[PDB]
């Protein structure tokens, strides 16, 4: 396939975006 | 100073397990504590 | 029967009563009475606690005067609002928490009155911030221990959540009494009015902090910070040498310049910048 | 006929009694296992654990010998284990109208009248278990007995079984005695009322009833009444994607930890299988900010429910949370794996669950064993080698004296989970169509909450789904097809108990034949038989097999 | 037009993958040392 090669590849940019904010929250929570 | 912070946090890697103490020594601590409680 | 899912609710005031009266006469086992609404078969909500004065000198639990609690029970009746006695307490001071043989007797005098009375132990030494340590108890029948039968018939994953202490396990622990998981009731009406009032400066940062001795104290840190930096010109040079674990055990007799240095850098930094900015706002604000 | 067609396809009995036919014909279980777990005789949870385990491994097969072996160790534990005993019978007789009243003819509440109103009270629970999603005489028969009865010692069983039979049906009739069941001002009616109050209104978003429920759960003092409704107001909204977010925002805005937890659930149900950015930001943030542990545990157990569509992503996010500072997040993390990847033998998820039994906390050792059971049902040594690596492990922990009853409780439960239905039933939160199986979703969601009620997670029968083809040519007539497979015949392995006191790949299969969903692609079509299927055999279930 | 249109989406996105993934790898170990300090 060629069409899924971009849809599923931006899909993990949406999915990937959350985790840096997540560990950004844990970075202060484990301090506190 | 801040660049000497940003380009030096690499080190923390490789090593990955910080064990609590053990499992079998926790069980033996439960047995010896059970014997002190029985005593 | 019970399901070891009893879940005592208490208060936000009675903890303060327990630590104050448990702390004032602390090496003697002080006691008093508990007073709240008795809700359903599972839970109980003890809203108030008043203490009882002692009988005489001696580390024990003395006795209870129903003249005194008859009157004190009626003072709040004709002044505040009626409640019900539900439990009682004493104070193992620096012991932890269990039931002594004296404790189980005066408990046994109270469970015959109401079958769901509550034994409570406060420990006002080993508590620091997150460890208050209370662990309210109640008797189990030794008759069923003679039967060899297991009481209390767990229907909920709520009981076996806190592991019991080894000292109470040495004591009557599971052969004469049981633990009860508790928690607390609070509200923002209280949370704000204790948060906003505990540590509050007033106009103090709008001052100048001993304006001659600020620079003098700044001198009074930098002067020994010089020789401490000379020790930092001493301690680096034994690297490319013996292993850093020996450079860890070996440094337990004499001070290091590193941590002691970065302490004073912080102290000079935050000591200066606050006096600078707070010095400069008043130039704008006052004329 | 076309006149009979509404009964054939809308009552749908010829999958009910025909999967029941597959259960009564196909039964591969063991006595020796419950002989091995028989040895743990003590008056702990163990009685309820065993008598819920045989119901777990004998769903709908009507096999009364693991109960009928004795009466003494059966009825030894009392006062709720007899309630669990009359609970466990309907799962054994699930999906069968006839042997419901006649076998419980001892167990009607007005026949023998013993001192146990639980043994005779919780029957209608099991009648609702048999006739879940089949509303008939179960409604009014299980309703007029609830018009006049005792207190909430039969009303739990009739209420839960009644709303279970009327699950997702929007019925004013059960809603009436659920109104007066709601306004009892009783603590013990809370699980009776708040559960079925949502069950009959599944996916209805009846905002007047929402206003009644959350308007009622703001003033009472008991907590079970604040908990059954905390499930029900989640249950009333289902798959909405935007249509609850003001209410989720309200419940999370409230100071009540139980109600914030209920919001967690509600956002867990309005986003089933949908990988939405809107849910995942706050949802994950609620398990990091909040101070109660319960809302953190439900907050991390929302993730497999919102992300079971792609099971490749939950091991990527939750393994980061297997090492939290609290065993609560370490616990709901493992149950988040156990709800996400349970359909597959995810080698990575088993790899995550390997050290999860090592932790010094008893309940995370427990839920490690529950998730370890859910990951590998109907999987024999060739999907993953860890199966018999863990079969010895459940025995290893159940035969210790020095463990906890809670610690071995996940093992004794995990037995009847692991060998359920004689390797003939399975979990499926998912049809092959892409549509999810919402009674299985309700069954696993309700199955989470065994913390606060033990036969609450007895509601698991709706998750047990077949892996079996059915060949058929008429409405009733069995054909006789014998097709085979092509691929490796060691995939077709069995439990094969040991009972201590040249390789054929042509697996000839009849019409009621079990087949792994991985084995749906490795089979052979019948090309030489007189019968040839007009449908392309990709799904199992039931098909037409055209006589050529 | 799918060559010069569609394939140009792939060469772009991967550059964001390669450094946001790397920032993630730095950041989660940066959690992990502190977490081991906490439980220890
Ligand atoms: Zn004492």
Cα distances (Å, whole numbers) of residue D44 to C13, D41, D48, D205, D368: 37, 8, 8, 42, 21
Asked if E35 and D320 come within 8 Å (Cβ–Cβ), the reply is: no
Left (φ > 0), alpha (ψ -120 to 50) or beta: where does D62 sit? Answer: left
Please compute, for residue D161, the number of CA atoms within 13 A of its CA located in the half-sphere on the CB side.
33
Residues whose CB falls within 8 Å of the CB of residue C248, separated by 6 or more in sequence, listed in order: none
Confirm or reject contact between A4 and chain D (CB < 8 A). Answer: no
State in Å: Cα C60 to ligand 1 middle.
7
C133: left (phi over 0), alpha (psi -120 to 50) or beta: left
Chain E partners (3+ C-beta pairs within 8 A): A, B, D
Interface with D, mutate which of B18, B27, B34 (most D CBs under 10 A): B27
Q: Determine the Cα–Cα distance for residues D230 and D228; give it in Å rounded to an integer.
A: 5
> Count of residues for chain A?
32
C45 contacts D406? CB cut-off 8 A? no
Q: What are C107's two structure tokens?
A: 């408990």
Cβ-based neighbours of D268, under 8 Å, separated by 6 or more: D234, D298, D301, D302, D305, D306, D445
Give the span between the Cα atoms of D516 and D482, in whole angstroms: 17
Q: How far is the CA of C29 from the centre of ligand 1 (A)?
A: 7
Query: Could you tell me if D187 lies within 8 Å of chain C, comparing CB atoms?
Result: yes
Helix (H), strand (E) at residue E12? helix E8-39
**Is B9 an interface residue toward E (CB < 8 Å)?**
yes
Q: Whole-angstrom Cα distance, residue D139 to residue D128?
A: 9
The verdict on C5 touching D (C-beta cutoff 8 Å) is yes
The CA-based dihedral angle spanning residues D506, D508, D512, D513, taken in that order and rounded to the nearest 10 degrees: -20
DSSP designation for D11:
I
Q: Helix crossing, C257-285 with C211-235: angle to 10°?
A: 150
**Residue C155 in contact with partner chain D when CB distance is under 8 A:** yes
Interchain CB contact of E32 with B (< 8 Å): yes
| Residue set of the binding site of C for Zn(2+) | 90, 92, 103
- Main-chain phi, psi angles of D58, to 5 degrees: -135, 50
Q: Give the closest residue to C38 by CA, choosing from C6, C72, C79, C3.
A: C6
Instruction: Count residue pairs from D and E with Cβ separation < 8 A.
Output: 8
Output the CA B30–ligand 1 centroid distance in Å.
26
CB C276 within 8 A of CB C211: no
What tokens does C94 get? 């620096």
Q: Are D130 and D162 in contact (CB under 8 A)?
A: no
User: Which residue in E13, E24, E30 is closest to A27 by CB distance?
Assistant: E30
What is the whole-number distance in angstroms between the Cα of residue C171 and the centre of ligand 1? 11
Quick one: closest CA in D to A14, which residue? D277
Residues in B touching D360 (Cβ below 8 Å): 20, 23, 26
Identify the bridge partners of residue D427 per DSSP, sorted by sequence position: D464
Q: Chain C contacts of D453, Cβ < 8 Å?
A: 155-156
CA C202 to chain centre: 28
Strand pairing class (D425-427; C118-122): unpaired
Closest to D138 in 3D by CA, of D124, D148, D152: D124
Compute the nearest-CA separation of D221 from chain C (Å): 8
Q: Please indicate whether, in this complex, the C-beta atoms of D360 and B31 are within 8 angstroms of each other.
A: no
Q: Assess D42–C contact: CB distance below 8 Å, yes or no.
A: yes
Residue D237 structure tokens:
């909204």
Q: Measured in angstroms, how far is the CA atom of residue C90 from the centroid of ligand 1?
A: 6
- 3-state SS, D76-89, equals CCCCCHHHHHHHHH
* Residue B7, SS3 per DSSP: coil
Q: Report the distance separating Cα D473 and Cα D478, nearest Å.
A: 7
Instruction: Give me ligand 1 centre to Cα C88, in Å.
Output: 12
Burial class (CB in 10 A: 0-12, 13-18, 19+), D484: middle
Q: Which residues of C are annotated as a binding site?
A: 90, 92, 103
How many A from CA of C142 to the centre of ligand 1? Answer: 20
Mark yes or no for CB contact A15/D313 under 8 Å: yes
Which residues of A fall within a CB distance of 8 Å from D280? 18
Give the integer Cα–Cα distance in Å for D456 and D459. 6
The CA distance from D532 to D548, in Å, is 6
Could you tell me if E10 and A5 are in contact, meaning their C-beta atoms sit under 8 angstroms apart? yes
Long-range contacts of B4-13 (CB under 8 A, 24+ apart): B9/E26, B9/E30, B10/E26, B12/E29, B12/E30, B12/E32, B12/E33, B13/E29
Compute, in angstroms, the gap from residue C97 CA to the centroid of ligand 1.
8
Q: Are D397 and D411 in contact (CB under 8 A)?
A: yes
Cβ–Cβ under 8 Å, residues D248 and D266: yes
Task: Compute, in degrees rounded to 10, the torsion defined by CA atoms E9, E12, E14, E20.
Answer: -130
Helix axes D329-340, D438-448, angle to 10 degrees: 160
Q: In this complex, is the C-beta atom of C187 within 8 Å of any C-beta atom belonging to chain D?
A: yes
Distance from the CA of B38 to the center of ligand 1, in angstroms? 21
Find, in chain D, the residue whose alpha carbon is nearest to that of E29: D320
Nearest CB to E28: which of D320, D324, D325?
D320
Per-window interface: E 8-37 vs D, CB < 8 A: 28, 32, 35
Q: Is there an interface between D and A (3+ Cβ pairs < 8 A)?
A: yes
Q: Are E24 and A20 in contact (CB under 8 A)?
A: yes
* Ranges of H-type helices in chain C: 14-24, 66-75, 101-111, 142-147, 166-170, 173-176, 188-195, 211-235, 246-249, 257-285
Dihedral sign, Cα of residue D173, residue D177, residue D179, residue D180: positive
Long-range contacts, C139-144 (Cβ 8 Å, 24+): C139/C99, C139/C104, C139/C107, C139/C108, C139/C111, C139/C176, C139/C177, C140/C175, C140/C176, C140/C177, C140/C178, C142/C175, C142/C176
Q: Which residues of D306-333 are buried (b: 16+ CB within 10 A; e: fewer)?
A: bbbeebebbbebbbbbbbbeebbbbbbb
Chain D CB within 8 Å of residue A16 CB: no
Contact A18 D275 (CB under 8 A): no
Cβ distance of B27 and D402 shorter than 8 Å: yes
| D273 touches D306 (CB < 8 A) | yes
The answer to whether the beta carbons of residues D461 and D91 sit under 8 Å apart is yes
Q: Which residue has the tokens 């950004």?
A: A24
Residue contact D450–C39, C-beta within 8 A: no
User: How far apart are the C-alpha atoms of C135 and C68, rounded to whole Å?
Assistant: 27
Q: Which chain E residues are within 8 Å of A19, Cβ to Cβ?
A: 24, 28
d(CA B32, CA D54): 37
Experimental method: cryo-EM
Calculate ∠ Cα C210-C214-C219, nearest 5°.
150
Interface test mutation site (partner B, options E29, E38, E40, max chain B beta carbons within 10 A): E29
Burial track C103-139 (b if 16+ CB lie within 10 A, e otherwise): bbebbeebeeeeeebbbbbbbbeeeeeeebbbbbbbb
CB atoms within 10 A of CB D104: 19
Inter-chain Cβ pairs, chain A and chain E, closer than 8 A = 44
The 10 Å Cβ neighbour count of residue D517 is: 15
Local structure of residue D485 (DSSP, 8 states): B
Q: Do D325 and E28 touch (CB under 8 A)?
A: no
Structure-derived torsion over alpha carbons of residues D150, D156, D162, D164, reported in degrees to the nearest 10 = 180
- The residue with tokens 């036919």 is D21
Q: How far apart are CA D40 and CA D408, in angstroms?
A: 10
| D255 contacts in chain C (CB < 8 Å) | 187-188
A29 to chain E, closest Cα gap in Å: 10
* Closest CA of chain B from D400, distance in Å: 12
Judge A/B contact: 3 or more CB pairs < 8 A. no
C48, β-bridge pairs? C35
Resolution of the entry in angstroms: 3.6
Handedness of CA B33, B34, B38, C1 (dihedral sign): positive
- How many residues are given for chain D? 548
D416 CB-near residues (< 8 Å, 6+ apart):
D52, D53, D54, D55, D56, D57
Nearest CB among E2, E27, E35 relative to A30 is that of E35
Q: Answer whether C160's CB lies under 8 Å from D407's CB.
A: no
3-state SS track over C162-214? CCCCHHHHHCCHHHHEEECCEECCCCHHHHHHHHCCCCCCCCCCCCCCCHHHH
Closest to D426 (Cα-Cα) out of D387, D460, D464, D469: D464
Q: Is B26 in Cβ contact with D402 (below 8 Å)?
A: no
Q: Residues D426, D377: contact at Cβ < 8 Å? A: yes
Cα–Cα–Cα angle for D78, D81, D82, nearest 5°?
75
Structure tokens at D7: 């009964």
CB contact (8 A) between residue D320 and residue E39: no
Nearest alpha carbon to residue D546 among D481, D449, D490, D496 = D481
SS3 sequence of D327-358? CCHHHHHHHHHHHHHHHCCCHHHHHHHCHHHC
Kindly list the residues from chain E whose CB atom is less than 8 angstroms away from the CB atom of residue D324: 35
- φ, ψ of residue C251 to 5 degrees: the values are -100, 40
């Amino acid at each position: 396939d060629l069409y899924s090669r971009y849809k599923k590849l931006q899909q993990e940019l949406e999915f990937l975006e959350v985790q840096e904010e997540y560990i950004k929250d844990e970075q202060k929570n484990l301090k506190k | 100073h801040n660049m000497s912070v940003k380009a030096m946090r690499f080190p923390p890697k490789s090593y990955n397990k910080d064990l609590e103490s053990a499992e079998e020594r926790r069980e033996r601590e439960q047995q010896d504590l059970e014997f002190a409680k029985e005593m | 029967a019970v399901d070891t899912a009893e879940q005592v609710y208490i208060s936000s005031l009675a903890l303060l009563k327990m630590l104050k009266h448990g702390r004032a006469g602390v090496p003697m086992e002080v006691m008093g009475l508990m007073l709240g609404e008795f809700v359903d078969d599972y839970t109980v909500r003890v809203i108030d606690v008043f203490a009882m004065p002692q009988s005489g000198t001696g580390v024990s639990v003395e006795a209870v005067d129903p003249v005194f609690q008859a009157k004190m029970l009626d003072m709040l009746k004709q002044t505040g609002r009626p409640e019900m006695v539900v439990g009682w307490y004493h104070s193992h001071p620096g012991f932890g928490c269990w039931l002594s043989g004296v404790d189980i007797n005066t408990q046994q005098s109270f469970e015959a009155l109401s079958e769901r009375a509550v034994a409570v132990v406060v420990d006002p030494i080993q508590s620091v911030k997150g460890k208050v340590v209370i662990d309210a108890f109640r008797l189990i029948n030794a008759n069923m221990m003679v039967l060899g039968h297991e009481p209390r018939q767990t229907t909920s994953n709520l009981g076996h959540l806190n592991k019991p202490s080894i000292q109470a396990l040495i004591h009557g622990l599971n052969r004469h009494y049981y633990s009860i998981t508790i928690n607390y009731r609070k509200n923002e009406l209280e949370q704000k009015m204790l948060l906003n009032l505990h540590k509050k400066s007033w106009m103090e940062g709008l001052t100048l902090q001993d304006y001659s001795e600020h620079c003098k104290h700044n001198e009074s840190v930098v002067k020994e910070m010089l020789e401490l930096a000379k020790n930092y010109n001493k301690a680096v040079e034994e690297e490319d040498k013996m292993t850093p674990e020996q450079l860890a055990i070996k440094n337990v007799g004499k001070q290091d310049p590193k941590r002691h240095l970065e302490e004073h850098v912080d102290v000079l930094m935050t000591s200066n910048i606050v006096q600078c900015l707070a010095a400069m706002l008043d130039t704008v604000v006052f004329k | 006929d076309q006149t009979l067609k509404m009964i054939k396809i809308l009552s749908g009995e010829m999958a009910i009694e025909l999967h029941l036919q597959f259960l009564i014909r196909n039964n591969n279980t063991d006595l020796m296992i419950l002989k091995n777990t028989k040895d743990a005789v003590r008056n702990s949870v163990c009685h309820t654990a065993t008598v819920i385990a045989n119901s777990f491994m004998h769903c709908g097969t009507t096999s009364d010998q693991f109960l009928r072996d004795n009466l003494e160790w059966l009825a030894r534990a009392t006062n709720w284990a007899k309630f669990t005993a009359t609970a466990s019978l309907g799962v054994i007789h699930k999906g069968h109208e006839k042997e419901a009243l006649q076998l419980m003819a001892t167990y009607l509440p007005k026949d023998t009248s013993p001192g146990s109103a639980y043994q005779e009270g919780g029957g209608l629970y099991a009648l609702g278990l048999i006739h879940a999603n089949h509303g008939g005489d179960i409604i009014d028969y299980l309703l007029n007995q609830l018009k006049n009865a005792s207190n909430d010692i039969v009303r739990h069983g009739g209420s839960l079984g009644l709303g279970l039979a009327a699950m997702g049906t929007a019925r004013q009739d059960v809603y009436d005695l659920l109104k007066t069941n709601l306004y009892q001002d009783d603590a013990v009616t809370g699980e009776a009322a708040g559960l079925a109050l949502g069950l009959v209104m599944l996916g209805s978003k009846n905002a007047q009833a929402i206003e009644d429920m959350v308007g009622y759960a703001q003033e009472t003092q008991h907590e079970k009444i604040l908990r059954g409704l905390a499930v029900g107001i989640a249950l009333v909204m289902y798959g909405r994607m935007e249509e609850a977010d003001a209410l989720i925002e309200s419940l999370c805005r409230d100071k009540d930890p139980i109600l914030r937890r209920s919001g967690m659930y509600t956002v867990a149900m309005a986003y089933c299988g949908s990988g939405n950015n809107k849910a995942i930001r706050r949802l994950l943030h609620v398990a990091v900010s909040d101070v109660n542990d319960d809302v953190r545990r439900a907050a991390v157990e929302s993730l497999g429910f919102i992300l079971f569509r792609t099971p490749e992503q939950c091991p990527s996010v939750v393994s980061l949370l297997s090492e939290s500072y609290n065993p609560h997040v370490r616990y709901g993390a493992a149950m988040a794996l156990g709800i996400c990847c349970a359909g597959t033998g995810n080698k990575e998820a088993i790899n995550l669950l390997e050290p999860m039994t090592n932790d010094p906390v008893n309940y995370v050792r427990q839920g490690a064993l529950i998730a370890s059971a859910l990951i590998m049902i109907q999987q024999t040594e060739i999907t993953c080698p860890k199966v018999n690596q863990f079969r010895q492990l459940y025995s290893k922990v159940i035969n210790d004296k020095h463990d906890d009853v809670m610690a071995k409780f996940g093992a004794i439960l995990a037995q009847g989970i692991l060998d359920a239905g004689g390797h003939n039933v399975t979990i499926s939160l998912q049809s092959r169509t892409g549509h999810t199986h919402m009674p299985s979703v309700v069954g696993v969601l309700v199955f989470t909450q065994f913390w606060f009620w033990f036969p609450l997670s007895h509601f698991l029968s709706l998750a047990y789904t077949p892996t079996c083809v059915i060949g058929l040519n008429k409405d009733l007539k069995m054909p006789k097809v014998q097709y085979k497979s092509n691929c490796k015949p060691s995939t077709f392995a069995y439990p094969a108990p040991l009972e201590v006191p040249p390789e054929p790949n042509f697996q000839l299969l009849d019409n009621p034949a079990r087949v792994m969903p991985a084995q749906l692609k490795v089979l052979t079509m019948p090309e030489t038989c007189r019968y040839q299927p007009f449908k392309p055999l990709s799904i199992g279930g039931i098909i037409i097999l055209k006589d050529t | 037009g799918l060559r010069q249109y569609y394939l140009s989406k792939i060469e772009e996105l991967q550059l964001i993958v390669n450094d946001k993934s790397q920032n993630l790898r730095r950041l989660q170990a940066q959690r992990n040392e502190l977490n081991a300090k906490v439980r220890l």
